[PDB]
Design an enzyme around this catalytic site. Structure first.
Site, PDB file in Angstrom:
ATOM      1  N   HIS A  77       6.572   0.770   6.346  1.00  0.00           N
ATOM      2  CA  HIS A  77       6.576   1.632   5.198  1.00  0.00           C
ATOM      3  C   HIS A  77       7.465   2.841   5.386  1.00  0.00           C
ATOM      4  O   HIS A  77       8.058   3.360   4.421  1.00  0.00           O
ATOM      5  CB  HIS A  77       5.134   2.014   4.895  1.00  0.00           C
ATOM      6  CG  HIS A  77       4.372   0.917   4.211  1.00  0.00           C
ATOM      7  ND1 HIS A  77       3.356   1.165   3.298  1.00  0.00           N
ATOM      8  CD2 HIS A  77       4.489  -0.425   4.286  1.00  0.00           C
ATOM      9  CE1 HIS A  77       2.886   0.016   2.849  1.00  0.00           C
ATOM     10  NE2 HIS A  77       3.565  -0.967   3.396  1.00  0.00           N
ATOM     11  N   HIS A 244       3.947 -10.430   8.641  1.00  0.00           N
ATOM     12  CA  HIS A 244       2.637 -11.030   8.327  1.00  0.00           C
ATOM     13  C   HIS A 244       2.238 -12.098   9.344  1.00  0.00           C
ATOM     14  O   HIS A 244       1.241 -12.835   9.182  1.00  0.00           O
ATOM     15  CB  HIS A 244       2.613 -11.529   6.875  1.00  0.00           C
ATOM     16  CG  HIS A 244       2.680 -10.413   5.875  1.00  0.00           C
ATOM     17  ND1 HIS A 244       2.761 -10.621   4.508  1.00  0.00           N
ATOM     18  CD2 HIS A 244       2.725  -9.063   6.062  1.00  0.00           C
ATOM     19  CE1 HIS A 244       2.798  -9.412   3.909  1.00  0.00           C
ATOM     20  NE2 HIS A 244       2.837  -8.452   4.833  1.00  0.00           N
TER      21      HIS A 244
HETATM   22  C1  HEM Z   1       7.122  -8.610  -0.203  1.00  0.00           C
HETATM   23  C2  HEM Z   1       7.022  -7.733   0.802  1.00  0.00           C
HETATM   24  C3  HEM Z   1       5.680  -7.288   1.264  1.00  0.00           C
HETATM   25  C4  HEM Z   1       4.513  -7.150   0.611  1.00  0.00           C
HETATM   26  C5  HEM Z   1       4.246  -7.364  -0.855  1.00  0.00           C
HETATM   27  C6  HEM Z   1       3.543  -6.748   1.592  1.00  0.00           C
HETATM   28  C7  HEM Z   1       2.206  -6.462   1.274  1.00  0.00           C
HETATM   29  C8  HEM Z   1       1.285  -6.001   2.176  1.00  0.00           C
HETATM   30  C9  HEM Z   1      -0.058  -5.623   1.901  1.00  0.00           C
HETATM   31  C10 HEM Z   1      -0.660  -5.525   0.524  1.00  0.00           C
HETATM   32  C11 HEM Z   1      -0.656  -5.341   3.063  1.00  0.00           C
HETATM   33  C12 HEM Z   1      -2.104  -4.882   3.196  1.00  0.00           C
HETATM   34  C13 HEM Z   1      -2.313  -3.389   3.291  1.00  0.00           C
HETATM   35  C14 HEM Z   1      -3.799  -3.217   3.588  1.00  0.00           C
HETATM   36  O1  HEM Z   1      -4.643  -3.509   2.712  1.00  0.00           O
HETATM   37  O2  HEM Z   1      -4.128  -2.760   4.715  1.00  0.00           O
HETATM   38  C15 HEM Z   1       0.310  -5.562   4.108  1.00  0.00           C
HETATM   39  C16 HEM Z   1       0.011  -5.526   5.477  1.00  0.00           C
HETATM   40  C17 HEM Z   1       0.955  -5.594   6.447  1.00  0.00           C
HETATM   41  N1  HEM Z   1       2.305  -5.825   6.253  1.00  0.00           N
HETATM   42 FE1  HEM Z   1       3.135  -6.407   4.571  1.00  0.00          FE
HETATM   43  N2  HEM Z   1       4.112  -6.687   2.790  1.00  0.00           N
HETATM   44  C18 HEM Z   1       5.397  -6.961   2.663  1.00  0.00           C
HETATM   45  C19 HEM Z   1       6.386  -6.955   3.652  1.00  0.00           C
HETATM   46  C20 HEM Z   1       6.150  -6.619   4.968  1.00  0.00           C
HETATM   47  C21 HEM Z   1       7.136  -6.449   5.961  1.00  0.00           C
HETATM   48  C22 HEM Z   1       8.626  -6.515   5.732  1.00  0.00           C
HETATM   49  C23 HEM Z   1       6.512  -6.094   7.136  1.00  0.00           C
HETATM   50  C24 HEM Z   1       7.047  -5.867   8.503  1.00  0.00           C
HETATM   51  C25 HEM Z   1       8.140  -6.384   8.969  1.00  0.00           C
HETATM   52  C26 HEM Z   1       5.104  -6.099   6.871  1.00  0.00           C
HETATM   53  C27 HEM Z   1       4.150  -5.952   7.857  1.00  0.00           C
HETATM   54  C28 HEM Z   1       2.790  -5.883   7.522  1.00  0.00           C
HETATM   55  C29 HEM Z   1       1.749  -5.779   8.539  1.00  0.00           C
HETATM   56  C30 HEM Z   1       1.952  -5.813  10.027  1.00  0.00           C
HETATM   57  C31 HEM Z   1       0.591  -5.634   7.874  1.00  0.00           C
HETATM   58  C32 HEM Z   1      -0.785  -5.550   8.428  1.00  0.00           C
HETATM   59  C33 HEM Z   1      -1.435  -4.221   8.482  1.00  0.00           C
HETATM   60  C34 HEM Z   1      -2.662  -4.089   9.327  1.00  0.00           C
HETATM   61  O3  HEM Z   1      -2.971  -4.986  10.183  1.00  0.00           O
HETATM   62  O4  HEM Z   1      -3.355  -3.027   9.221  1.00  0.00           O
HETATM   63  N3  HEM Z   1       4.940  -6.430   5.529  1.00  0.00           N
HETATM   64  N4  HEM Z   1       1.473  -5.975   3.550  1.00  0.00           N
END
Ligand code: HEM
Ligand code: HEM
Ligand code: NA
Ligand code: NA
Lengths: 713, 713
Positions: A77, A244
């Site tokens: 982010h 993810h």
């Molecule tokens: C279309 C693009 C993306 C969407 C719509 C998206 C959406 C989200 C959402 C909604 C969450 C959950 C937040 C929560 O409720 O804690 C999340 C978690 C996360 N995203 Fe994505 N994401 C995207 C791209 C990415 C990218 C590019 C990365 C890293 C390279 C990333 C890494 C993560 C990680 C590691 C989590 C887990 C957080 C945790 O374990 O607390 N995401 N993402």
């Protein structure tokens, strides 16, 4: 308390040019972050970060006993606000810790992530900026969980107040499209410079476009927004599937349980927000996005399980416990671990936007290739993560520390190393004489150097005169650059260059990039001479010439000036008034209001306007460096009125006779209208100001010529 | 574009502390206005002004062939924004030329007056500031029309952006009282710090209170507002009758003819506004206030004809051509000249507020005395005009030029000349050691010097430690100053001073004012020593001691700190949150956000709190100069909650055990809540910050000690 903004809400805002003063900066005026970072024991910091990963705090317990996923999200982010249109946003200024980003809905509970980092920040102090620390923490999270990163550079200096960034006009968080301030029009066309689908999101809506859970249409939004953040399909797939592979989302109960974001919270919350009344409010009960998805069977270890799941199941639309649209694997066993209860397992689940990677035809092919060739996926994700996190850092000369990747990447707009003696003062004098003897005019020389140097923007540190990219596609073809005139100038300069370089012994040679700038300087010198003044314009050699193959044409398009008030140029008609565009450009150039003022008044009289337009050319001695622009602008003997044909062009007539004296645009006349600009114009239009004007003009000219000179800085 | 102010409209605004940066200033860092002014040929400027008075411009023709009245009103409005409550407003920064003042309804057509002065401003450039020139022009107007002024001082440096001033909460220009943002409550009690009756007026409504044409009730508003601008009944009568000896009002047709104020006008209007569609729109057809009154038979010559008319006729309520309430003389001949048509005359006319001077019984006595003794009127008016125009200039040491009056006036808070050798560095060292040997504690010494120095406010440059007025009424009895403790400290210091001065030869002596400050310096040095750090705190002697007889006790009331977050002090309960009051205080002290932050954190641990409150005292080594405030505030091991008894007092408890560790106020905890202030607190609470903290604290301490030291300027 009613403010000027309340009374005159559409008046120009200059305070964006006077951000980041020495006043608001707690560090001394001589603090040099690069020097502090270079002495940091980076290895020690990384050890502490590794330890932190599994040191769970009770006020925000670690999922699966490992904060890695949370920190990857935090870092993604931090970087994810970046827009290629203006270079604004990104990780490079640590702005996630200030308003509004610290309180965007999509940054919910990243306040907790940053707070977990305070003890390390505290321990190392000024030797590691927040900005660097947020990215380094992401890197260490990856490494801790088994993923080998491509590298890391330090050097992101912290900033001390919010960046002035247009993030959209909506007055409601997360407003769906088609509202009174819609960022979309036509066939889902996102307004430039925006790079997100709703106010307060990083890129797209994880449920799908405006909440509609269609992976195919979500793909369109993903492609568009990631492209507006400088990422192509391969990089986008690698990043989403890579991210993810780790962690989980949080949606354990209804969102109505979640209270005020940090900037709205009570003083007792001590900078945190989104306090939740749901059960324990944290940990197993966490609510962040409202989604409740865990992607893999090992959320704290790098795996190839994301694409195994994506392709290995068919998917069924369901709802999280907060009511959000998400997908569950049809017929699957409970194979996904619970974050807190070792007795519980879960079926595989996916976001709508995860399914995009399979159901969009172009993504599908990449996703399948990554599924079949996991080493390709790992490499692509490593490279894309580095790009994501460094895309706004500027030239490689700014990269600090022992982990900087040696590989030169196209998106860095690389400039070759200099491998030869540079020209000295005698040489510069000889070259300037040759330039002036060639017949090139003041107007041509100043226009060309302006065109070359003024592509810089401080937002992502792209652009500038280093590289001589003005001679390459696409810069050589930009309308603002006057392609035919530019061709003739560059031909003449290249001939001078060839003859000078051919006469040298040793390896001494001058680059075209240097010569373009030096020729500009000679134009300014000649202009001052024309006005009866001796003047010296500083010049620093050491620019090099980049090749066409080192110059990504599609990436360079975003630097095209479609408005440049300093050349009285507007490529088309925009909603935003041209004086607002001028201030925006001044901000990208790092100019204060006095600098903008002095520079524009001088450029006008030197013949820098596109097309040699007479608009704003308030002098009878064009190509002489005088303060005529200001003296004539401020002459009450002249009356101004908009033309019948064009309300944005104004005619200045003698008040007594009606005789036409001048014409000007909004950009010209704002200096006689805006009460702060006019106060600046008055200083330069006073009878005691000719020498001040010249000296201030030369200083700001030199500033612009050096904006990308991080090899000197 | 939606801004942080939009999203979080109630968050604290720090940007008022970062105005007037070097970024926005067109003059170089080394520009010294006093150095420029002292070389101005003031006599030449006055001759040019004198010629201007009768050189009419066709775009704003001079009434009676003479701009004198217009320029007197201009100068009176420049000065007339001043409020004694906070010292804000007044003529001293030339703010009339910026928003909002340049576009207040009461400043209508003064845009024309200032534009008339551009050729003179332009001629003399940086050697005369707009701020000075507005006042000088009023003086020259008076002189040209036969009135002998009391003198003139230059030295008002120009400013380059609008001052942040609270002028009220109404969202409509001129809104009558009793609205949703009424500035009145109770029995017509005007809210502090305001000093006008409606938004956009200088003092009062010339028709009468909220438009009601009753002179008796108008007089109440006049008295209240003028008192809130530091003028008593004699001064008020003298000023109103003095001004209305000259010129006329303008209301030749309906006000609906008048268009946008300058900040709202089109770009072509080039900084002017109120363009009128009535007939020629100017001159004989001018509309400004909507009133159409000409007071005397010779509007371009000093006379005693205002009181001759006021008392020689009875007055009848009538309406101007714009429909405004005004008064005409019953049965009178046409004896008043027309401004343009030498064959027309008019009956005497008056404003409701002019008649206040006869129908308010206290005003009537003064008015009658001035009527019978016009030499008394002329002297009172001269003295009051000087006070009006100089009241925000600060100590007489700032007064520049050849026309400064030699007479010392009580309202100047005068400081006696120093007529003896000053103490040197060795003497200062001897005195610091004697102060520390006396048994005075770090807390006493710091608290006392803070109390003395921190009355300064940069709004009108009143207050500070010079004068040693802390020992006099009323400062010695202010609750914030802890009168009984203060008395004991001063007794001890005075005995030190007696012994030192008795031992000297050669006339060398130290003032109590200097010794109070030096003693505080010793306290800060001792506190640093207590922390294991040897530092020298700068000290500059040369303050003098003022007497009670040279101190206006009633005028000094407005300097009482009723909120001083630097001593965790709030005298009572206010509508405005305490952290907003802290930032207001920091602005008056001229502190940046970093300065404010450092200063507060150090004061807390030095024992500066009023009453030895433990609030914010986040240290176990009080009276040692450390960064404990920041380290402890930012410790996430501590959880904060408001107390049951008092929502504005917070307990900090160990998160794990519940044990009480600290208590704090809003002022303390804002540094751990506000995202910009917390970022500052983090720098000073970092493990590398001890040396920085001490150095920056010493710097800001010395800055505060020297705020009024214009003798060193
Ligand atoms: C279309 C693009 C993306 C969407 C719509 C998206 C959406 C989200 C959402 C909604 C969450 C959950 C937040 C929560 O409720 O804690 C999340 C978690 C996360 N995203 Fe994505 N994401 C995207 C791209 C990415 C990218 C590019 C990365 C890293 C390279 C990333 C890494 C993560 C990680 C590691 C989590 C887990 C957080 C945790 O374990 O607390 N995401 N993402
Ligand atoms: C109760 C206090 C005051 C009231 C309500 C008041 C009201 C006004 C009004 C309504 C105008 C007419 C503006 C226009 O239509 O052009 C005016 C004009 C003027 N006022 Fe006052 N005034 C006050 C005090 C003063 C003071 C203290 C001075 C200076 C010592 C002053 C000097 C003038 C002068 C010289 C003009 C004439 C301007 C011209 O000839 O263009 N006024 N006043
Ligand atoms: Na950026
Ligand atoms: Na003031």
């Amino acid at each position: 308390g009613t403010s000027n903004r309340d009374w005159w809400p559409n008046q120009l805002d200059l305070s964006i040019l006077h951000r980041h003063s020495s006043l608001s900066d707690p560090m001394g005026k001589d603090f040099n972050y690069a020097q502090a970072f270079e002495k940091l024991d980076l290895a020690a910091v990384k050890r502490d970060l590794h330890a932190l990963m599994t040191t769970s705090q009770d006020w925000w317990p670690a999922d699966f006993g490992h904060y890695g996923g949370l920190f990857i999200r935090m870092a993604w982010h931090s970087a994810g606000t970046y827009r290629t249109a203006d270079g604004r946003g990104g990780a490079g200024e640590g702005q996630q810790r200030f308003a509004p980003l610290n309180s965007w809905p999509d940054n919910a509970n990243l306040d907790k992530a940053r707070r977990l980092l305070w003890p390390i920040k505290q321990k190392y102090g000024r030797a590691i900026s927040w900005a660097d620390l947020l990215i380094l923490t992401g890197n260490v999270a990856l490494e801790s969980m088994g993923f080998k990163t491509f590298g890391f550079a330090g050097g992101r200096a912290d900033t001390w107040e919010p960046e002035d960034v247009y993030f959209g006009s909506e007055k409601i968080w997360l407003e769906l499209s088609g509202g009174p301030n819609s960022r979309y029009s036509g066939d889902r066309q996102l307004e430039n410079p925006l790079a997100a689908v709703q106010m307060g999101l990083i890129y797209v809506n994880p449920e799908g476009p405006d909440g509609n859970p269609d992976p195919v249409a979500a793909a369109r939004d993903i492609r568009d927004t990631f492209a507006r953040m400088a990422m192509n399909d391969e990089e986008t797939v690698a990043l989403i599937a890579g991210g993810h592979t780790f962690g989980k989302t949080h949606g354990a109960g209804p969102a109505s349980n979640v209270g005020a974001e940090p900037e709205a919270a009570g003083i007792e919350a001590q900078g945190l927000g989104w306090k939740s009344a749901y059960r324990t409010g944290k940990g197993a009960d966490a609510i962040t996005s409202g989604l409740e998805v865990t992607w893999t069977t090992t959320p704290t270890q790098w795996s190839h399980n994301f694409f195994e799941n994506l392709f290995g199941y068919e998917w069924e639309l369901t709802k999280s416990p907060a009511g959000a649209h998400q997908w569950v694997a049809k017929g699957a066993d409970a194979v996904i671990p619970d974050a807190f209860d070792p007795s519980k397992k879960h079926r595989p689940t996916m976001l709508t936007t995860d399914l995009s990677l399979r159901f969009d035809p172009a993504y599908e092919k990449i996703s399948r290739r990554f599924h079949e060739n996991p080493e390709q996926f790992a490499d692509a994700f490593a490279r894309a993560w580095f790009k994501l996190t460094h895309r706004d850092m500027g030239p490689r000369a700014r990269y600090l520390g022992p982990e900087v990747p040696a590989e030169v990447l196209l998106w860095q707009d690389p400039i070759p190393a200099v491998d030869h003696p540079l020209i000295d003062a005698a040489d510069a004098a000889e070259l300037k004489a040759k330039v002036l003897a060639s017949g090139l005019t003041v107007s041509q020389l100043v226009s060309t150097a302006w065109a070359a140097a003024s592509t810089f923007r401080g937002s992502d540190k792209r652009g500038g005169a280093n590289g001589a990219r003005i001679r390459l596609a696409p810069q050589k073809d930009w309308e603002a650059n006057q392609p035919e005139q530019l061709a003739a100038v560059l031909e003449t300069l290249e001939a001078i260059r060839t003859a000078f370089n051919g006469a040298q012994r040793g390896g001494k040679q001058v680059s075209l990039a240097d010569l373009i700038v030096l020729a500009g300087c000679a134009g300014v010198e000649q202009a001052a001479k024309n006005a009866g003044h001796a003047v010296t314009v500083p010049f620093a050699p050491g620019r090099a010439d980049a090749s066409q193959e080192q110059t990504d044409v599609e990436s360079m398009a975003v630097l095209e000036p479609v408005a440049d008030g300093f050349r009285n140029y507007l490529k088309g008609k925009y909603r935003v008034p041209a004086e607002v565009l001028l201030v925006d450009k001044a901000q990208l150039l790092t100019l204060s209001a006095p600098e903008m003022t002095v520079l524009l008044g001088g450029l006008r009289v030197l013949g820098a306007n596109v097309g040699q337009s007479r608009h704003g050319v308030f002098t009878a001695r064009e190509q002489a460096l005088t303060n005529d622009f200001f003296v004539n602008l401020l002459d009450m003997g002249t009356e101004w009125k908009p033309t019948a044909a064009d309300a944005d062009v104004f005619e200045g007539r003698d008040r007594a006779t009606g005789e036409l004296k001048w014409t000007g645009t909004r950009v010209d006349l704002v200096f006689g209208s805006h009460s702060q600009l006019r106060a600046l114009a008055e200083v330069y239009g006073s009878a005691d100001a000719q020498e001040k004007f010249v000296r201030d003009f030369v200083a700001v000219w030199n500033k612009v010529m050096n904006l990308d000179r991080f090899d000197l800085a």
